[PDB]
DNA sequence: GTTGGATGGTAGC
DNA sequence: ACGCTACCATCCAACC
């Protein structure tokens with residue numbers, strides 16, 4: 477079995493470069509008015525002409541400007557990047573029908589029935605990289621291996637404008653050689669739980685007994701890491717389907733006043749209910765982001781679908797429930813809909 | 818105590 | 831990403 481993972485290089489900035497080639501060779505930074513940094517926003521993506529100097533995703537814009545004060549700072553236009561992406565996914569479909577859209581710029585492909593071995597796979601990659609650049613003028617990185625996870629690590633090693641195959645041997649090498657942290661699904665929090673307890677490779681997970689690993693990172697991550705180290709990881713390429721649609725809005729000032737908050741909450745409903753686009757949810761959750769930036773939520777599932785009026789009415793009840801059960805002022809209010817009929 | 822689903826949260830991306 | 835998925839401990843209703 478063979479998996480090909482495509483990852484679009486610095487996607488949003490790249491798209492902006494395409495929609496405006498004058499920007500090529502200039503440092504380009506795509507900004508978001510993101511969580512922590514509600515003064516000047518944060519870097520969503522930067523091109524390599526900006527990354528070279530350390531301007532990377534998630535750093536505050538106030539810090540970017542200290543590095544590249546003459547760079548181009550662009551508002552992020554997600555709707556544009558979504559279109560372009562979908563056109564690329566279509567191009568990927570013409571190579572394999574078995575595809576898994578992991579995110580706006582990431583897709584897995586099962587190419588087992590398209591190639592005979594890794595030599596031929598590399599060339600398909602080259603063809604794919606060639607097609608995207610041709611049709612969308614976007615450099616992408618291609619990762620090829622025997623499974624999704626390793627295909628992904630491959631692309632991580634070759635970023636940007638790269639291509640890599642991790643053969644069956646190197647897979648065995650990486651199970652012994654690679655830092656556990658660089659495995660997909662392992663972030664800062666989980667790695668601490670592993671680095672503290674002497675687990676730095678995948679192979680280390682075969683040593684430790686299952687229950688103490690379960691009661692530390694969970695049944696899922698445990699089975700997942702065991703499976704990888706044991707070289708038995710065999711997860712099929714499946715179609716992802718949207719499972720929830722939500723929206724969060726920031727208020728002018730922190731509050732606990734229901735009448736002051738209601739309008740922002742209704743804004744969230746209108747906007748997320750519009751997005752449902754013919755889908756009928758059975759669950760509704762209201763989130764509050766509090767003044768200290770902690771996240772709280774109250775939801776309900778119905779034996780039937782939620783009409784926009786039920787959404788309005790239940791929402792108020794859910795936000796009342798938050799207001800009774802949490803003493804903190806609220807900074808952001810939001811809603812999400814799930815369990816579609 | 819068990820089973821299925823629901824809840825409010827964690828973690829990663 | 832102020833958006834989303836998967837997961838988890840716990841809760842809940844109902845129970846031969």
Ligand SMILES: Nc1nc2c(ncn2[C@H]2C[C@H](O)[C@@H](COP(=O)(O)OP(=O)(O)OP(=O)(O)O)O2)c(=O)[nH]1
Pocket residue numbers: 483484485486487488508510519520521533534554581831
């Ligand atoms: N809407 C939104 N998308 C974001 C934000 N930050 C990052 N993203 C998107 C753009 C990126 O493709 C991706 C960031 O994490 P990734 O590691 O998956 O990006 P990746 O290394 O694959 O390449 P990319 O960052 O272009 O260079 O998610 C944000 O604040 N808001």
Ligand SMILES: *Nc1ccc2c(c1)Cc1ccccc1-2
Pocket residue numbers: 722723724761762763773810811812831832833
């Ligand atoms: N980005 C984002 C948007 C909406 C929501 C989250 C993240 C988490 C959450 C939880 C409950 C309702 C809505 C949201």
Ligand SMILES: [Ca+2]
Pocket residue numbers: 483484485486487581
């Ligand atoms: Ca990317």
Ligand SMILES: [Ca+2]
Pocket residue numbers: 579581582
């Ligand atoms: Ca990405």
Ligand SMILES: [Ca+2]
Pocket residue numbers: 657658659660662663664
């Ligand atoms: Ca990691």
